[model samples]
Target: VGSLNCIVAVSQNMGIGKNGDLPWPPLRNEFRYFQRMTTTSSVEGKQNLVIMGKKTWFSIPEKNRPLKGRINLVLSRELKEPPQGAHFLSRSLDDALKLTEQPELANKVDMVWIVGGSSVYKEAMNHPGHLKLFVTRIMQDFESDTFFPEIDLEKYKLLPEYPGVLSDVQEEKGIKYKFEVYEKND
Candidate 1:
């Protein structure tokens, strides 16, 4: 039983993207938070795993493709093989998660992060192994074609505070946002 977590930045209206890209301009501070969160590991030799849909993988700039220092698993049934720079490829979120537990990776993967497109988010949310949602709620709204899945409060509990996470609202380029953590309730 491994823990699966999700990380996303949503607008006031729960919008995540528009036309396969971020709705808003680049946010350096936000990206830094993501970099630190996904790359950090308790075990020195172990690294975290980031599982993302094909679109999400491609959305990242070419230079940043593999998201250095961590394992990148691209979920794409269409791809015959792992895309260039990607460490692995799987057709389903479940399969991607299972790959982390395989003997070859069990010791190397310290954490699993579901980075996504809308459908991928939905599937990961339904997966019983998903434990935490690391949401950065944008205070403004933007025109977005993609939206995050609605969370069932009955199943997830919002934590007032999380270790090593900023509880205060963050702002960059006049856009305000805050990070929140929702843990699955047993």
Candidate 2:
């Protein structure tokens, strides 16, 4: 069994690609970069699991459903049956962690990535465990209706980053993002 610790999130406010178009211009490409980094060949034999909400699952394209090799876990209050390939846990985030701590489930996966749509991220962040967050700071001033909860920067330290660039999407310019890994100090 692997350590049932660390939460990974791409966007705290919203996800990468939603209903139709990409939320931001460079967001699509940046996400692809993230996937490549997260699913590197170095971790080839390791099992990586992603925990997300129902809306996040639906956001993925039908063809790319189930997220291939990784375990896709869905958290929902209304799901009666588990989806085709996903393991459904009809409970709150706490229950999901309880399930993850099971010998059978914990033994199979090496890393757990918590992909989300706000609520899931909030719960994962609130947990008194260590987690690593991958944040992409976009330069666009989107009149977003949603937002990520405030995270205490004092708890995390910046690791590395790529320089900013001009955007090809809209009026907003793009800023190069970095991969920030946060470990709980307490």
Candidate 3:
């Protein structure tokens, strides 16, 4: 069975996006970290999957997408097929997850990453499975129209540190941030 892991950057107030894009200016290092985490897999000969809502899929610049080395699965209710560069399309998170379990994809996908808009994150967090939340906590509050769903701490434990993830706070352009991981309770 494939597990669902989410990677996101959120502000002090848990705001993730505004106007179809990130609220803050791009943090190049953070972007790099995102790419590395989603693209690399411990298991050889298999690639990871990045699942996103329709808007999240569009947010990426045309030149850089389908996100290079991973499978890009976009979820939508109206779309009939994968967008120009996306590898797959589904109507819901559940449908998308099932698609990954099918024989055609099961062996080829090593990890599943939920890269999102508010609705997609909400659905994935509610889904039962092995789950890990990789969050980049931005220390400053910024104006935002979209926010990450409130996490249920009773169901997921936040670890002080996780392997292969930076533990200390980092600063860029005077902005302070740090990575945090939360594992679902068994």
Error of 2 at 38 (Å): 3.8
Structural similarity to truth (TM-score) of each candidate:
0.95, 0.74, 0.96
What would the per-residue lDDT of candidate 3 be over residues 1-186, giving only the tens digit for each residue?
356799899999889989988888889999889999889887888999999999899999998788989999999889998999899998988888888879989899998999998888888888786799898999999889999998899998899888888999898888999999998944
Ranking by TM-score, best first?
3, 1, 2
The residue pairs in collision within model 3 are: none
Residue 52's lDDT within candidate 3 is 93
**Residue lDDT tens for model 2, 1-186:** 343333332333444443433455544556664575444322445677777788777777777778766777888888877666675554677877777678767666667777776778777777776566665555444434445566677775554442332223222235434344455544
Q: Indicate whether candidate 2 or candidate 3 has the larger lDDT.
A: 3
After superposition, which runs of candidate 2 have C-alpha atoms over 4 Å from their true positions?
Answer: 1-21, 26-28, 40-45, 160-176
- List ranges where model 3 is wrong by over 4 Å: none
List clashing residue pairs in candidate 2.
1-107, 164-176
Task: Write one digit per residue (lDDT tens) for candidate 1, span 1-186.
Answer: 245788999999889999888888889999899888888876777888899999999989898899999899999999989999999999998788777778989988888888898898898777774489999999999999999999888888899999889999899999999999998844
Once model 1 is optimally superposed onto the true structure by TM-score, how far is the C-alpha of residue 119 displaced, in angstroms? 1.3
Error of 3 at 139 (Å): 0.6
